[PDB]
Ligand binder design. Structure first.
Ligand code: SAH
Ligand code: NA
Lengths: 265, 265
């Protein structure tokens, strides 16, 4: 009679919490989704093995349109687990799933796990200084969206950092790279010419957060736009004015040029 | 000869990630701090029992002044772990400790854990809509902190939610409740009269996130300022312009007054 929303964490099968793993093991049915994001440091097989339960994978349509016909029915008589990468309820449409559960007379509990939102603290940037977040999306056809550019502008204008998720093609497994994201932003800067993203802008690139050997790089766009950050997923951050301690971290830990100690502080 | 920063999570010893547990079990020395946050659902004993090691708890002074004398020295020959509540680098100054580790020729790694920063997702509020964060600090003698009041104003003007970390004096076993935070805010409103935080302001309270039964409440200050939300830790959130689905969740899951369903766009 219970539904558990369990986060799988950041990168591999060991990123789930002890509580989440033990609970998942005692569930009769286990579902999961990998359309909001993917566990690049592992496989479905490794996760199934660790849990010892068959994992029924669900698509975006399965979740958004038929959650109540696929998941909730089984929760009426058994304990069901729903696994998602990161922290449950972070993906904007997932909170609503708990309402569907209530309507179905099904109890639901949330088992947290690490999220990129909190994991970006490894960049040395103070968490309280982050402002609104955005997603960099690929233009397509006659559609050229640029809201993510305005978000950076609103934040930087107030001395706040901007966390940028990069467009992902879940099923086609086609991730947008930090390099690609920078190119798009430079192109958006050439149209709106607001002086928000240029070759002199300082950015931070975080890749494979959660891994024991993540890639943390900071520098000006002109030097990082062609650098190789490794395998996805990539996260882009456009910092606002830095606190000296933030700058010292980016320099000592993320190889940023000493120049930021005077230009961006 | 390495140093591991390992987060313990939100509420109890099971909120640690499997990755963190397996590594912590193999460290020669284990240190920790419990002044940056409160893990209401566990004890040092349970943690030690789960990890199978004795944990030397450090005070804020031991850490902020003598980290390189108490911890780093051992890391130069043994595998050392440093445990903290939630995620080690979120809303703390522990990131700077990685710089010290580096300067002393000690490699460090970070194992994330669920954090209050991403756990706000359980409130139903879109996490991408959160703006700058702030801390409601206890007034000290004649010094009365107010900066956190201007943060709410800045975000509200932009329609962004505001996450408010609540103060803590671990050495005195004092943990600010949401009620206390609301009282301090009304007092600041009385001084500045910016129409930022009044008895008609809608607020959200999340208490003991990470537990199976956290307290999630939403409503007007006048009605919530004297309500009992259970034991600490608590966080206070001042939402901005709400999406309809955010409001539906606050009402259906957080017991908010059906009135907020009628959103003014
Ligand atoms: N489980 C929990 N529930 C509610 N608030 C919490 C909480 N854990 C931390 N907080 C809030 O955050 C403050 C500590 S700030 C340090 C946060 C920690 N590194 C993390 O990642 O969560 C507390 O005083 C409280 O206001
Ligand atoms: Na944020």
């Amino acid at each position: 009679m219970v539904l558990y929303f369990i986060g799988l964490g950041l990168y591999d099968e060991r990123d789930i919490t002890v509580k989440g793993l033990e609970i998942a093991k005692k569930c009769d049915y286990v579902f999961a989704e990998f359309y909001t994001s993917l566990m690049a440091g592992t496989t479905l097989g490794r996760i199934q093995k660790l849990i010892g339960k068959e994992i029924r994978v669900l698509s975006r349509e399965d979740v958004e349109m038929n959650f109540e016909n696929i998941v909730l029915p089984l929760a009426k008589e058994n304990d069901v687990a729903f696994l998602t990468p990161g922290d449950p309820l972070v993906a904007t449409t997932h909170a609503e799933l708990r309402i569907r559960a209530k309507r179905a007379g099904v109890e639901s509990y949330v088992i947290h796990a690490p999220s990129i939102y909190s994991a970006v603290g490894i960049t040395g940037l103070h968490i309280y200084k982050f402002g609104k977040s955005a997603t960099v999306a690929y233009p397509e056809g006659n559609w050229f969206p640029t809201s993510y550019y305005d978000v950076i502008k609103e934040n930087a204008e107030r001395g706040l950092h901007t966390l940028l998720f990069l467009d992902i093609k879940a099923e086609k497994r086609m991730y947008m790279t930090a390099n690609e994201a920078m190119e798009l932003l430079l192109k958006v800067e050439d149209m709106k010419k607001g002086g928000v993203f240029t070759d002199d802008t300082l950015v931070v690139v975080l890749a494979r957060a959660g891994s024991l050997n993540p890639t943390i790089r900071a520098g000006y766009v002109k030097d990082l736009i062609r650098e190789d950050f490794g395998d996805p997923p990539h996260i882009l951050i456009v910092p606002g004015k830095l606190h000296i301690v933030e700058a010292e971290y980016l320099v000592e830990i993320a190889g940023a040029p000493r120049e930021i100690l005077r230009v961006n502080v």
